[PDB]
Amino acid sequence: FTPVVLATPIPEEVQQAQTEIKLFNKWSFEEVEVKDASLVDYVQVRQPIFVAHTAGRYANKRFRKAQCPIIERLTNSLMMNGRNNGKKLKAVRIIKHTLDIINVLTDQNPIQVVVDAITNTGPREDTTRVGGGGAARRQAVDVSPLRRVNQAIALLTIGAREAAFRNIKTIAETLAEELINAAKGSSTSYAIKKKDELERVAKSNR
Amino acid sequence: GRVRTKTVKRASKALIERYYPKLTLDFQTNKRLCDEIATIQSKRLRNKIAGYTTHLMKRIQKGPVRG
């Protein structure tokens, strides 16, 4: 590599960024694989981004949110419970800190930890309400992979937000151990426990 | 939906009935001749009429059309 000198000088690390696009100029999207063959084509990690803020239109068509990058989908789900509606700058800062904490706590690629958490906590079977003759009965059904990704993200971020509320731990830290425990399947994760409970209820209601 | 009303359909059929060899299978030329060969009060209505006319010319090129 050779640096190039401009009249407005450009720092060496962002000049390094010309060779490869990395998340926050730190995390390579290469060598990240989705372990679940069902959740590949619905977890999007093939297109790299510098920042988890793309003003993209994924709501017009039925399946464009699958082509939305998965880090920005996690970021979007962080902007919840009314007071934080909007505030994507706060959400992307939280995501950046979360990835740093993940890499510190385990030497793995934090994007790989995120996709492992999503693949591990997508609920594989669920149940739906039927008529049942005036009383609610629940009939076990299967879950489509897009719904598995959506509900995995919702469970992970809801667990992080609930465990960060009224706590000295920050939201980035709480999301970091939430994603780490879900990636291990450690059952100390909120999302792992919720996924297990839903699958158990569906198995009972077969 | 993109269903075209009877004003467009009837104008297109009348245009084809009395101007078939003059007009073509191309929307741009059909538009450019329709605006001078008919009196249509709206550019939008002229575009819709010329488009349905071009569609019917494709239909006519693929065998005859009833009506």
Partner: protein, 312 residues
């Protein structure tokens, strides 16, 4: 000898409406398209690439209908559906002159040899003739439907007596004008449909005019009498004479029919392969132009490409 497909040129996203070449620069090709632009290409004479775009000319606000080059290739002219003409510096883009005054879509432009003055036939049933500086020196009326093409007749002798132009419109009537004094001299009757195109031979004695009925009608304007008609059996959009051989190429809706005239028979009748479009309709050539040496035939199609053919 036979024509063989050599390569394609890809820079447009609309129908390639016209092609122009220059004797001065045998490696230049100018193409005007439906994407409101012109492209000047540099030819390489090699494998599948065969040529690269070196300049785009932008500034027309609608479909640019045709284009011509001067003999040296320094200046280009474009006629467009925005009711204007434009003169471009081929080296630097750079519109020198805007010609305004037509009241409808100008469909044909042609510089005369010697770069003296410009004719343009439009959709308001007029043929306006202009100076280089951009003033309408005259307008020609009396042509009852809208004009499809105008062309200049090349003088075999070096400026023998005068300069004449020919024109075809949609009133099934082609015309020949002496614009030394702005009169009509020849009025050829005989077409039965909208005439799309007409071409004068490099000899200056043959006129080929053709349109939607598929009848390529030949005229000898030296004697001012009709000679015969060829049949393409389908709509034909462009005609061009080979500058050295006795060949006439016609861009029909199904192929490009090229005819030699000394036995008067069809020689090749080339049809390219598209790998697609089979359900509705194959794209067809809407423009074609020979080279200055008559060895390569360029053809601009409706699938926004230009295909080239080389003779053996």
């Amino acid at each position: 000898e036979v024509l063989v497909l050599r390569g394609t040129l890809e820079g447009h996203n609309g129908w390639v409406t016209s092609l122009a070449t220059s004797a001065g620069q045998p490696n230049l090709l100018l193409s005007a398209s439906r994407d409101k632009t012109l492209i000047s290409w540099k030819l390489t004479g090699d494998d599948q690439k065969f040529g690269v775009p070196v300049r785009s000319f932008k500034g027309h606000s609608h479909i640019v209908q045709d284009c011509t080059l001067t003999a040296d290739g320094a200046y280009a002219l474009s006629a467009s559906w925005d009711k204007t003409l434009r003169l471009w510096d081929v080296a630097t883009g750079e519109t020198y002159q805007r010609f305004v005054g037509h009241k409808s879509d100008v469909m044909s432009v042609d510089i005369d040899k010697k770069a003296s003055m410009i004719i343009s036939g439009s959709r308001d049933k007029t043929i306006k003739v202009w100076t280089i500086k951009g003033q309408c020196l005259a307008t020609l009326l009396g042509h009852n439907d809208w004009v499809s093409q105008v062309r200049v007749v090349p003088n075999e002798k070096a400026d023998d007596d005068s300069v004449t132009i020919i024109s075809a419109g949609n009133d099934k009537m082609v015309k020949a004008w002496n614009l030394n004094q702005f009169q009509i001299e020849a009025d050829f009757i005989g077409h039965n449909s909208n005439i799309n195109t007409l071409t004068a031979s490099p000899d200056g004695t043959l006129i080929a005019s053709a349109g939607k009925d598929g009848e390529i009608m030949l005229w000898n304007l030296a004697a001012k009498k009709a000679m015969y008609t060829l049949s393409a059996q389908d709509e034909v959009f462009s005609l061009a004479f080979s500058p050295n051989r006795y060949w006439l190429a016609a861009a029909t809706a199904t192929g490009i029919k090229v005819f030699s005239l000394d036995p008067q028979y069809l020689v090749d009748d080339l049809r390219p392969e598209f790998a697609g479009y089979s359900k509705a309709a194959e794209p067809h050539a809407v423009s074609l132009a020979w080279s200055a040496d008559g060895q390569t035939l360029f053809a601009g199609y409706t699938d926004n490409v230009i295909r080239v053919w080389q003779v053996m």
